Structures are given as C-alpha cells and as structure tokens.
C-alpha cells in the first residue's frame, strides 16, 4: 500500500495461512483426534467388578479360569461324557465364569421383576456397567439426558431363556425386546436418557474393539460428544462351549495358553467391559478424567482365509498397519501389544508371525507381547475392551503385567529376531520421555481383525491442584434403595479405611458432582474425616446420627418459606460473614440499599452479640425500627446464600414481613425497593 | 529483483490460498463426500428378487 510494496497482500496471506492452519487442524481433528478413555468399568471373571480389582489380578498373575458356573444350574452332567462327539458335550471343563450373571438389580434400572427375568445377562451387565463407567468418570449418570452420547456395545447374540416361540408365563413380550442384541446398546440409551448413535455392533470376538473403533470414528467426526464403547459376552446356556467344542476348538482345561507350547485352543471365558470415550480436547475442556488416549483404530476382515474361523496372516498385518498409519505413529513407538493370544495352535503362530511383520521390523527395544485372556480367559466379545482396560491400567500403574501361561513359548513361532519379548514376568513400564503406547488387537471367528493403538494420558502437571483448608462441604450419599444406601456407606467407608487422609473436599466433590441424585439420600457435613468415617459406619447399619437421611422420588423444587417475626436470636449470623464472603457481600448490597433508608446499618448489628450490642445504639431485639430491616437484610442475604449454593426456589412465600424478603428475592420488588 | 514483495508475498498467497482450496475440499470430502449407490440387490416380500 504505502511503505515498501507490501502492506495489504501480506494481510491476505496472513489470513490465507491462519485459515490454512485452521483448516488443516480440522483434518487432524476429524481423522486423527485422540479419543480419551474417560473411564473403564468391567465385570471380568475372578470376581472382578472394577478395574482396581483388575489391576489386582494382572499384577499378582492370577488366572481366573476356575470352573463352569453352577450359579445358573447348568447341566454340566451332560456337558461331559467319555465319548467327545456326544451332541451336547463340552470340552472346556473350566473357564472364566462370573456369578454376576444370575444377579441384577431390577428396581434400580426401572424394570419390573418380570421384564428383568427376560433381560439377557449380556444387557443386564451392560446396564450395570453403563452406570458405573459414568459414576467413575465424574459424569453424573443422570446428567446425560438428551445429550449426544453413543452407546456402542459389542455382543455375540447369546440365547437366554425360553425360545421366542415358547414364551414364558410372565416373560412374554419382553423376551424379544430383552434378548435382541438391538436393545443392549438401546436399553442403556433409554435408561440413561442418551440421544446419540446407540448401535450394537457384532463382529464376533472383536466386537469390543470394533465398537471402540466405531465410537472413536463417531467422535473424531462428531455425532456424539461422548460415547460408551464396549462389549459383553456372558454365556447364558452352555450352547457355545458345546459347539465350539464340536469343531474341537476348545482346551480341556479352560486356559488360553497364549504363545505357549501347551496351546490347546481357546480357553473360552465370559466377561464384560465398557470405555467412556471423548475427544481428547473435549475431555480436557470439560475436566473429565483422561486415563489413556486411543490414537488410532482399524478394522480389517480376514478376506478369503482357509476357513471361516481360520485366521489370515496378512490381514492382521494390514490392520496393525492401518491403525498404525491412522494414529500417525510407527511400529517402533508401541512399547507393548495386548495381542489376541487365543491359545490356539494355528491362530497364535499366525498372530505372532503377523506381529514380526508389522511390529517386529528391526525393533530397537523388544515388543512386550502380552494377553489379558491368559490371565482372564477368551473374553470373546468382551476381549478387545478387556485389552484396553489391561493396557490402560498398564499405563496408569507403570507396569506391564504377566502373560500367565507362556513360559514354554511355542515352537511353531520364530522368536529368533529378538523383537518380541512375551511377558513371562512383570516388566516395568515407567513414564519415560517417549510416550507410552500399546496395541490391543482382537481378531474374531467371523474374520474381522481389529487393532487399536493406545497412548498414555498427556502428563497433567497441575490441573485441579491444592488451595487451602476451609469450611467442609456435605458428603453427598444417595442410592435407589434403603438397603443400597447402607451399602454406599459401607463402600465409601472402606474406600477411606483403605485410603486414609483423603481430602474431605475431594470426597465431597466426586460424591456430589460425581454421582446421581438417587431417591434415598443420606448427605452429611463432617468436621473431620474420622467424624465422617464414624457416620459412614453408622449408616452401614442404618443408624443415622450426624447424618442427614431422607427419602425422595427425584423431587427437587424447594420452596423458600419466609418467617415474619420470632426467628431472631442474640447473635444472628455473627460468624456466617466471618467465614464466607458470600454472606458478608450478600449483606453488603442490602446494606447499601438500606443506607439511604436507615441510619444505623445492619453491618455492626449482627457482627456484635447481644452482650456487646448494648453499646452500639441498637437493642438486641426491641428496636423494631432497627431489627425489622435487620431481619429483612439477614433474610435476603441468607436467601442469596442458598441461591449461591445452588438452592433455587420453585416458589417463594412470606409470612408477615418475610413477604418483603420474598418479594425482594422474587424479582417483583428490587433490593432497594423492598429494603426501603 | 522480484518486484519486491509484490510478486513474492503474492506468489506465496496463491499457494496459501490454493492450499486452502485443497485443504477445505478435503474437509468437504471427509464429512460430506456424497457416496454413490452403485448397485441394489433386494429379496423382498412377494415375488421380488
């Protein structure tokens, strides 16, 4: 324009670049945006009901293949016969089986004691997990109503009760809508109120990583701001270990001896698992916990294999390389791999030869090859989300857990490159300078390989840090049953006798803004954590002393009732303004609205006790010319206090002069108006 | 010289714009690339095959 020969075009270039910088950051936020694992809930066998118990099975190298379930009353009798071709016999004589299958809380989830008998245990556990995964990600499970949030559940349709053409007595129309894989992801979105893509995918034993991949690819784009991605296989009938045994694919002892010379086949188990997932710059902007980031995912069918159940050796290399070129990484960044490790004698040699071809390509540091199934059992459709719970507790515990049955590494694989180090021992895995990434791979019977690359959470240096000790807030307990509320203060009590000195403000933040406002409420404001621990033990027995118990029906709607006269004491709020500036300042606006209409101000009145109010020209109560405005000022400041603490009235009603305060707080009369 | 900054900072603007015209038609193909229906097979109620 004027100076030199550039003052205008160099503004359109600045803009064409900050538009190119902001349009090529939109391409990397739509196909490669990290998807944070906001929380993980899992009902894996071995009594595992939560990942902390799960970090307590992998770390001690405990196998969870105990035996067949007798809690459902199976016909194990016939599941076994010397002749192994009997049409109804099973070869797995063990396996990882949970007792949480024949167990559910119908009343909590709003289903009748007849609609729930029909509820397929796969869905039944998924409903319980959907509530937990939220209750441990912070997000109140009842706060996600009409919120875009996809439920992506992976399920191998399994057969529960009477055939749909042989309807029961109470279970009849609800036998198809409680068992259709359709309504496992759908029951969740209904009970939780979610309005997002509630898709129940089915890709055999990769339906958890496919559901995780289908949720990550539903997030990178944006159709659901949040997403619950996971999968469950709880096997109601012994109909899967009696068919898988008919193709002689099972092991006679139920162990998935991954990458081991004793490999017999799958050690088929049953389990669940759910991940709460959100775009990494949506779980940092909302403060949600970020446990690990799912960098990239890939799904790749085996193609024309040598059998439907037969694995492809060059369709896994193209899925370990699609998830490795969609995450923007390379084969040398992934420290460890949670491989399928089915324990098969022709699927493990093919898996690992696909792992020396996509990862073990001149590896400077050996790949730590490990398998949750070994410690657990082929979790079928829950395997792949039980590998992103294993390799997300491996992120956050600084340790690669064991592969429990692989000391005698199989002789059908070539472990000569020294590029893969099967995890026969707990390998330390601390936070170094290079990000800690892992790979979880689930390949299925249908021939749909899936591979997901996990990375450790971006090191949060400060985040929500410490300020100062001060007034303590109520410990907010609530449950949907009077016997479940005793169990809440029988599990928070333990979560503090196991973890003592836990900041009270932190047990009143993730209990109040971390849980749902369920009917049976027992909040309590505790001076100390032992005062608390005391009330916690009292509520375990139902004895409320120091605890504010109550009952509700999702009630809300408080009413500010305003007494006219007779509620004054000699020291009304003497320290209520000395402890918080939300009452002192609340008094300040009333005072400056009372100064032009009153001489003596309210500030020194409630500041001083009656024993010291006798010398400030303001009697304790008899001065109706002074205490009536004081009453109104105390009243309005207190009402503003409850409003500042989130207590808003559905109605204000005043008695005689509390009418003035009610009008002041209702908005019909200004602060100065009602003050005058 | 190159017509100082008249034929240069305007030569970099036909790249930073022609790259913006190709980094925005990648976003219109990552979100709204219209997919075809190349063929349709149906076995539906009745004689439909």
């Amino acid at each position: 324009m004027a100076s030199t020969d550039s003052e205008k075009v160099a503004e359109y270039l600045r803009r064409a670049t900050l538009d190119l910088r902001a349009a090529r950051q939109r391409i990397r936020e739509l196909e490669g945006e990290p998807v944070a694992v906001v929380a993980m809930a899992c009902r894996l066998p071995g009594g595992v009901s939560t990942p902390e118990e799960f970090w307590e099975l992998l770390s001690e190298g405990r196998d969870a293949v105990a035996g067949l379930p007798t809690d459902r009353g199976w016909d194990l009798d016939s599941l076994f016969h010397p002749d192994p071709t009997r049409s109804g016999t099973a070869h797995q004589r063990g396996g990882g089986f949970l007792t949480e299958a024949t167990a559910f809380d119908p009343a909590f989830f709003g289903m009748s004691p007849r609609e729930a008998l029909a509820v397929d245990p796969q869905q039944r556990l998924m409903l319980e997990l959907s509530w937990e995964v939220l209750e441990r990600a912070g997000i109140p499970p009842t706060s996600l109503q009409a919120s875009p949030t996809g439920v992506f559940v992976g399920l191998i349709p399994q057969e529960y009760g009477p055939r749909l053409a042989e309807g029961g007595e109470g279970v009849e129309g609800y036998l198809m809508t409680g068992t259709t894989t359709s309504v496992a992801s759908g029951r969740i979105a209904y009970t939780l109120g979610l309005e997002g893509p509630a898709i129940s995918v089915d890709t055999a034993c990769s339906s958890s990583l496919v559901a995780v991949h289908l949720a990550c690819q539903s997030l990178r784009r944006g159709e659901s701001s949040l997403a619950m991605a996971g999968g469950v296989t709880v096997m109601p009938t012994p109909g899967m270990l009696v068919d898988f045994s008919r193709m002689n694919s099972l092991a006679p002892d139920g162990r998935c001896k991954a990458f081991s010379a004793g490999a017999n086949g799958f050690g088929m188990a049953e389990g669940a698992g759910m991940l709460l997932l959100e775009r990494l710059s949506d779980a940092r902007r909302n403060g949600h916990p970020v446990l690990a980031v799912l960098r990239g995912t890939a799904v790749n069918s085996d193609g024309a294999s040598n059998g439907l159940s037969a694995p492809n050796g060059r369709a896994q290399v193209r899925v370990i390389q699609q998830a490795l070129a969609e995450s923007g990484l390379g084969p040398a960044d992934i420290d460890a791999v949670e491989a399928h490790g089915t324990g098969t004698r022709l699927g493990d040699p093919i898996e690992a030869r696909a792992l020396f071809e996509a990862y073990g390509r001149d590896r400077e540091q050996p790949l730590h090859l490990g398998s949750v199934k070994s410690n657990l059992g082929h979790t079928q459709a829950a395997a792949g989300v039980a590998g992103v719970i294993k390799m997300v507790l491996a992120m956050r515990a600084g340790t690669l857990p064991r592969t429990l049955h692989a000391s005698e590494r199989s002789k059908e694989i070539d472990w000569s490159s020294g590029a893969i180090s099967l995890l026969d021992e707990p390998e330390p895995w601390p936070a170094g300078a290079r990000p800690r990434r892992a790979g979880v791979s689930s390949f299925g019977i249908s021939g749909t390989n899936a591979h997901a690359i996990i990375e450790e959470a971006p090191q949060v240096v400060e985040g929500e840090r410490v300020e100062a000790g001060d007034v303590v807030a109520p410990w907010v307990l609530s449950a949907s049953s009077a016997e479940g509320l005793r169990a809440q203060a029988a599990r928070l009590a333990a979560h503090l006798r196991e973890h003592p000195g836990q900041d009270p403000r932190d047990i009143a933040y993730s209990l109040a803004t971390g849980r749902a406002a369920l009917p049976h409420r027992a909040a309590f404001a505790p001076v100390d954590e032992s005062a608390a621990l005391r009330v916690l033990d009292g509520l375990a027995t139902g004895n409320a002393d120091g605890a504010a118990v109550g009952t509700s029906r999702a009630q809300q709607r408080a009413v500010f009732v305003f007494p006219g006269q007779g509620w004054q004491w000699a020291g009304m709020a003497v320290d209520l303004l000395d402890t918080s500036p939300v009452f002192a300042a609340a008094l300040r606006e009333c005072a400056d609205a009372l100064e032009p209409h009153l001489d003596f101000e309210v500030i020194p009145f409630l500041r001083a006790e009656a024993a010291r109010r006798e010398q400030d020209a303001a009697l304790s109560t008899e001065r109706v010319d002074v205490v009536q405005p004081v009453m109104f000022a105390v009243m309005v400041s207190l009402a503003s206090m409850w409003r500042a603490h989130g207590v808003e009235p559905a109605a204000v009603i005043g008695h005689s002069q509390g009418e003035i305060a009610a009008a002041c707080v209702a908005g019909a009369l200004s602060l100065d108006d009602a003050a005058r | 010289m190159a017509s100082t900054d008249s034929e240069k900072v305007a030569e970099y603007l036909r790249r930073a714009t022609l790259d913006l015209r190709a980094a925005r038609q990648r976003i219109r193909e990552l979100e709204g690339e219209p997919v075809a229906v190349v063929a349709m097979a149906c076995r539906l109620p009745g004689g439909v095959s």
Partner: antibody
Amino acid sequence: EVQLVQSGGGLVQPGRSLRLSCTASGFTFGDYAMSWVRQAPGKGLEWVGFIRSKAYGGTTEYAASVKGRFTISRDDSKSIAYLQMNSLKTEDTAVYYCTRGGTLFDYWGQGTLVTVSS
Amino acid sequence: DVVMTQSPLSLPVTPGEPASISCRSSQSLLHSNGYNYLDWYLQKPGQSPQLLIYLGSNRASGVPDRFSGSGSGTDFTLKISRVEAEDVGVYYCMQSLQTPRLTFGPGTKVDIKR
C-alpha cells in the same frame, strides 16, 4: 483464541479527552496493523484510522474527518492498541470497534459505545 | 479516482432458500496478481462486524460454508447456499484496491422474507 476485547467508553461533553484501549490476546500483536472503525448509531461503518505494524514503520493513517484530533498507538510489551480521542465533538457518539487489519479487518473486537453529548 | 461499489441494498432472504448479494465496482478490483481485492463483511444486528470473504472468493475460517464467493473485476457475488436466521443483517461490500476507505458502503440491508 484471538479476542480483541476493548475498553474505554463513556459520557463526555464536546472538547474532552477520552481513551480507547484494545486488549489483543491470541495473536502476535506486532504483526497485524490494528484499525478503529466507527459506526454512528444506526448507519454504516466508517473507518477512523489505523496504525501500521512496528515492522511496517508504525505510520498512522487517519480519516479526513478526524485528522489533527485523534491519534492511534500500539504497544507489544503491554500488547494494547490505543485510540486517543482528543477535542471530541457531537459526531463521536458511536460504537467504536478495533479490527485487526488495515485493509483486511478481522476479529473486530466487541464494540465500545462512546457518547459525546452536552 | 475512488472505487464506487454498489449492491442490492434491500435484499430480502427467506430461510432455507439460497440468496445472492451482488457488488458492482466502478473501477477494476482484479489487481495484477490475478486476485480480486474485494472483501465481504457481515454485521449481524447489534454485534461486531464479521469477516466473511477476503480476496473476492476466499472464505474466512469460522464462517459457515453457506457464504460462497465469486466475481470478475467489476461485478461480484456472495452466494449463501442456505439462509438461516443468523444470515440476516448488513452485508458490506468493501474494496481493498484503494486504501484508505472512509466508508464500508451503504451495505445490503438483509431481511427475513415474507
């Protein structure tokens, strides 16, 4: 983000001195050439002036309507643009904006309502 | 001299219907670089003016894809592919060839059409 948040409106009598501050946070303040566009109540935008970048000289170009009256400055270490409005008359009752471009107005800020009434 | 730019000052838009504001310049805004020096600004009613288009056809980031840009050296056009309830206001055709520009133009007074 870039946010050009402004401050400094108010009520004065014709012939006063008023300050208009443009807080720039999100971009390198010294690269752009901030400008101040006036919009009298309910009519079209009129451009008051703009300071060139410190690297472009810092020459300040003003309008014909306000030459010898207004002066515009900028600071990087304190990262603020200034419209120094001296000898105001009745015309300055308006919503003054701060855009981040001499020929390519960008963020525009928010809108500082300045009023010059007697 | 100065570039005099005019437009359909009182253009009505009905929601969901493509609309088209046009600009006509007396002089030629196609500078030698082959880049037009016309910009399209939007002042939404009672808000800070927005930059919709720079260099005639290029759209600023953060601006809805609806606003499309085109034009020769004299006649120009803004093609809103989809007018919604935020697409209403004043559309200023503002040149860049001859800075300084004391005015942003009369601006196209856009209205929801009935």
